[PDB]
Design an enzyme around this catalytic site. Sequence first.
Site, PDB file in Angstrom:
ATOM      1  N   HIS A   1      42.420  45.426  46.749  1.00 44.24           N
ATOM      2  CA  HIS A   1      42.769  44.294  45.902  1.00 44.24           C
ATOM      3  C   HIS A   1      44.227  44.316  45.455  1.00 44.24           C
ATOM      4  O   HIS A   1      44.648  43.382  44.763  1.00 44.24           O
ATOM      5  CB  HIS A   1      41.803  44.176  44.702  1.00 44.24           C
ATOM      6  CG  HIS A   1      41.983  45.212  43.633  1.00 44.24           C
ATOM      7  ND1 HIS A   1      41.062  46.215  43.415  1.00 44.24           N
ATOM      8  CD2 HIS A   1      42.947  45.375  42.696  1.00 44.24           C
ATOM      9  CE1 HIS A   1      41.464  46.970  42.403  1.00 44.24           C
ATOM     10  NE2 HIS A   1      42.603  46.478  41.947  1.00 44.24           N
TER      11      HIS A   1
ATOM     12  N   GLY B   1      46.326  49.333  35.435  1.00 45.05           N
ATOM     13  CA  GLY B   1      47.130  50.202  36.274  1.00 45.05           C
ATOM     14  C   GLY B   1      46.441  51.452  36.787  1.00 45.05           C
ATOM     15  O   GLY B   1      47.048  52.196  37.564  1.00 45.05           O
TER      16      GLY B   1
ATOM     17  N   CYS C   1      43.798  51.722  38.744  1.00 47.87           N
ATOM     18  CA  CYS C   1      43.123  51.605  40.021  1.00 47.87           C
ATOM     19  C   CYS C   1      43.802  52.514  41.029  1.00 47.87           C
ATOM     20  O   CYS C   1      45.002  52.771  40.945  1.00 47.87           O
ATOM     21  CB  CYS C   1      43.156  50.149  40.480  1.00 47.87           C
ATOM     22  SG  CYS C   1      41.906  49.215  39.596  1.00 47.87           S
TER      23      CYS C   1
HETATM   24  C1  LIG Z   1      42.976  48.314  38.518  1.00 51.15           C
HETATM   25  O1  LIG Z   1      43.990  49.103  37.860  1.00 51.15           O
HETATM   26  C2  LIG Z   1      41.949  47.773  37.504  1.00 51.15           C
HETATM   27  C3  LIG Z   1      41.300  48.874  36.662  1.00 51.15           C
HETATM   28  C4  LIG Z   1      40.639  48.213  35.457  1.00 51.15           C
HETATM   29  C5  LIG Z   1      41.685  47.702  34.463  1.00 51.15           C
HETATM   30  C6  LIG Z   1      41.132  48.069  33.087  1.00 51.15           C
HETATM   31  N1  LIG Z   1      40.148  49.111  33.365  1.00 51.15           N
HETATM   32  C7  LIG Z   1      39.886  49.233  34.664  1.00 51.15           C
HETATM   33  O2  LIG Z   1      39.151  50.046  35.188  1.00 51.15           O
HETATM   34  N2  LIG Z   1      40.913  46.934  38.127  1.00 51.15           N
HETATM   35  C8  LIG Z   1      41.114  45.614  38.183  1.00 51.15           C
HETATM   36  O3  LIG Z   1      42.173  45.084  37.851  1.00 51.15           O
HETATM   37  C9  LIG Z   1      39.989  44.746  38.662  1.00 51.15           C
HETATM   38  C10 LIG Z   1      40.435  43.892  39.860  1.00 51.15           C
HETATM   39  C11 LIG Z   1      39.280  43.498  40.770  1.00 51.15           C
HETATM   40  C12 LIG Z   1      38.581  44.740  41.298  1.00 51.15           C
HETATM   41  C13 LIG Z   1      38.269  42.644  40.023  1.00 51.15           C
HETATM   42  C14 LIG Z   1      39.806  42.674  41.950  1.00 51.15           C
HETATM   43  N3  LIG Z   1      39.599  43.883  37.568  1.00 51.15           N
HETATM   44  C15 LIG Z   1      38.823  44.373  36.606  1.00 51.15           C
HETATM   45  O4  LIG Z   1      38.494  45.547  36.597  1.00 51.15           O
HETATM   46  C16 LIG Z   1      38.397  43.393  35.542  1.00 51.15           C
HETATM   47  N4  LIG Z   1      36.969  43.440  35.322  1.00 51.15           N
HETATM   48  C17 LIG Z   1      36.170  42.503  35.837  1.00 51.15           C
HETATM   49  O5  LIG Z   1      36.604  41.381  36.073  1.00 51.15           O
HETATM   50  N5  LIG Z   1      34.891  42.830  36.069  1.00 51.15           N
HETATM   51  C18 LIG Z   1      33.914  41.978  36.745  1.00 51.15           C
HETATM   52  C19 LIG Z   1      33.650  40.688  35.970  1.00 51.15           C
HETATM   53  C20 LIG Z   1      32.597  42.734  36.820  1.00 51.15           C
HETATM   54  C21 LIG Z   1      34.371  41.644  38.166  1.00 51.15           C
HETATM   55  C22 LIG Z   1      39.176  43.573  34.234  1.00 51.15           C
HETATM   56  C23 LIG Z   1      38.862  44.922  33.585  1.00 51.15           C
HETATM   57  C24 LIG Z   1      38.818  42.419  33.301  1.00 51.15           C
HETATM   58  C25 LIG Z   1      40.672  43.513  34.514  1.00 51.15           C
END
Ligand SMILES: *[C@H](O)[C@H](C[C@@H]1CCNC1=O)NC(=O)[C@H](CC(C)(C)C)NC(=O)[C@@H](NC(=O)NC(C)(C)C)C(C)(C)C
EC number: 3.4.19.12
Lengths: 300, 300
Positions: B41, B137, B139
Site C-alpha cells: 500500500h 509510519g 507499517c
Molecule cells: C502504516 O504505517 C499504517 C499503520 C497504522 C497507522 C496507525 N496504526 C497503524 O497500525 N497503516 C495504514 O496506514 C493503513 C493503510 C491501509 C492498510 C488501510 C491501506 N490504514 C490504517 O491502518 C487505518 N485503519 C483502517 O482504516 N482500518 C480499516 C477500516 C479496518 C481498514 C488507519 C489506522 C485509520 C490509518
Amino acid sequence: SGFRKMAFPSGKVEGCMVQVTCGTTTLNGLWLDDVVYCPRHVICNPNYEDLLIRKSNHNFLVQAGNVQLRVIGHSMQNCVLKLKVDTANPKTPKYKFVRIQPGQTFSVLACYNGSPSGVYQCAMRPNFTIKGSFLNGSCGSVGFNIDYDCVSFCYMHHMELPTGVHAGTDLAGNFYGPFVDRQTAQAAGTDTTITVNVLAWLYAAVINGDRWFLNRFTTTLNDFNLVAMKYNYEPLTQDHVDILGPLSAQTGIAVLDMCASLKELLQNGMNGRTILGSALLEDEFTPFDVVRQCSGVTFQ
Amino acid sequence: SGFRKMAFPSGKVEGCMVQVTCGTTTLNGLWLDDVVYCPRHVICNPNYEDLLIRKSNHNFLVQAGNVQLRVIGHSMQNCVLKLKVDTANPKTPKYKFVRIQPGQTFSVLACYNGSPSGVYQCAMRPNFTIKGSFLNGSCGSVGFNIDYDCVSFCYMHHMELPTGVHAGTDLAGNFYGPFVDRQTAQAAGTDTTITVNVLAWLYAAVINGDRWFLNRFTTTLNDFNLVAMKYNYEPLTQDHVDILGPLSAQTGIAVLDMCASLKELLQNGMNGRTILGSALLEDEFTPFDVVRQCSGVTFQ
Ligand SMILES: *[C@H](O)[C@H](C[C@@H]1CCNC1=O)NC(=O)[C@H](CC(C)(C)C)NC(=O)[C@@H](NC(=O)NC(C)(C)C)C(C)(C)C
Ligand SMILES: *[C@H](O)[C@H](C[C@@H]1CCNC1=O)NC(=O)[C@H](CC(C)(C)C)NC(=O)[C@@H](NC(=O)NC(C)(C)C)C(C)(C)C
C-alpha cells in the site's frame, strides 16, 4: 495505537557483549573501546583487594565470540573490574554512564556466556532492586537507555535476593541500594509503588482510548499524598506534577484531576476491569516512556 | 529466577530496516540481500495491479540511513512489494520466512522512517490479530523469532483495526486472518484465550516458586476442554499435552493435573492474588518461551 512494555532496540549493546572467564567462573562483560567492564566477583566475606593483587592478566579469559581478547591490564572501580584489552571494540557506540534514580526505567539485555538471550524492560524499584529475569551465568548483563544516538548504560547485574528480585551496580560499580557483593544475609527492604509512573500510565490509557476510570473530581496534592501513604505509594512532588505537564496538556486532564482518578482506583479497585490490558495499576512506565511510545520517537 | 515478557535481541533485524518513500507515503522496508520488502500500500477499493504498472523504479525512494539505495526492479507478491536494489545488505543475517500458527509468539521491532523505535513481544491471537503498539509510519515494521543464528521473520505490519489491534502479513505478503489492505469495513472477530500458553505460564510460575494455585485434583482432557469452552478458551489437544511434556517432567506436575488447576482458577478467579506479577491469566508465552527463559537459551 496500543501500549506495550517496550524495550529499546538492543543492537548497539549486543555489539559490546563478551564472555569473561576466570578460574571456574564465567560471566558477561561489556566491551567499550579497549576496556571490558564486568562484576568483580568473577575473581572469587571476600577481600577483593587481596584477591585481585594475586591475579595475573592471563588468568582472565575474555572471548569476544570466537576471538580471544587478551588482557593487558586490570583495575577495580568499586564493584566492577575494568579489564584493559589490546583491541578497541569497533562496534563501540556513542555512550554515557549514568546512575539513575529510583522510578526510572531501562532495558536489560540478558546474556549468557557473552551472547544475548533476550531483552526486556525494568524499573529501578524504590527499594533499589529490579524485578529481572536472570539465571546462573547472567551476571554482567547490562541495563540501558538510548537517547537519539547515545546509549546510557545505567545497570550491570550482580546477584539475586532470596525473594527472587535482583540487585546490581551502575557501570562505575556502585550498587543501587544497600547491597554488597558478598554472600551474607541481605534482603530487599519494603518496596513501594512508583506514583508518578502510575499517573503517566493512566495518561497512556487515556491517549489510547481508555477513559472509564476518570471522574469529575479533583484533589489537592496534599490530600492526594494522604491516600497514597495508605496504599504504600510514593509521595507525589510538585516536580512530579510539572513532569506530568506535557501529558496533562495533550489529554486536557489536569494533573490533580488524574490524581483524583488514581485515588478512586486505590479506594475501590478496578472491579474486574482492566486498563491497557492489566488488572493491576502499572508503575514501570515513566512519563517520558509514555510520550516516547505515544508520539513515536526513534533512535539513530 | 524471575519471568519477564522477553523479546529477542533485535540487532540482527535493526541492520535490515530502511525507509521507503513513494509519492506522499513513507514507511519502513526490510532489506535482505538486494531485496527490500515492504507493504504494497506504499503505492496508494484500489487495484494494486494497475497501480503498480503505472509506477517507475525512480518513484521509489529507499533511504538506508544517509545512503539512498537505487531501485532497479520491483515485483508484487500477494500484499508485499519487493524492491530490487542495486546493493546487497552487508548486514543481512541468516534468515527464513515462516508463516506461524495462532498461539505462536514473536518479537516486534517497531520502526518509523527506517529507524527502530522499540522492541516488544506479541502473540498471533486466535483471531489472527496482534495486540501491538503502532503509530502512523509504522507499517513495514516486522516480527520475528531467532533460532540459534537464524532470524525467522513471521510478520510485517500493515494496518490498525477499529478496536486498536493490528493486522499484517507474513513476509510473503499473505495476511494473517481474513483481512485485506483496503479501506473497507473490517473487524477483528471474536478472540479466545490460548489455553496451551496459559498452562505453560502456570508451569513458568511453578518453576519460579509460585504453587498457590495448584491442587490435588486431576481431570480428563475431555472434562477440562468442557470448562474451557465456557470461559472462551481454546480446546486443548493431545498434541498440546505432548508439547507440555517437558515442562511437566521438569516440575513433576502431570499435564492433566495442571489443567485441573486452570479449571479452578477459571471458576474461582484469583481472589486478589497474582501469578508472576499478573492479576490476569497470561497467554502470550508458549511452552517453548517458558523453557527458553527458564533454562537460559542464547543465540549467536
Ligand atoms: C502504516 O504505517 C499504517 C499503520 C497504522 C497507522 C496507525 N496504526 C497503524 O497500525 N497503516 C495504514 O496506514 C493503513 C493503510 C491501509 C492498510 C488501510 C491501506 N490504514 C490504517 O491502518 C487505518 N485503519 C483502517 O482504516 N482500518 C480499516 C477500516 C479496518 C481498514 C488507519 C489506522 C485509520 C490509518
Ligand atoms: C552471576 O551470574 C549470578 C547471577 C545470579 C545467579 C542466579 N540469578 C542471579 O541473578 N550472581 C551470583 O552468582 C551471586 C554472586 C555474589 C554477588 C553473591 C558474589 N550470587 C547470588 O546471587 C546468590 N544469591 C545470594 O547468595 N544472595 C545473598 C544471600 C543475599 C547474598 C545465588 C542466586 C544463590 C547464586
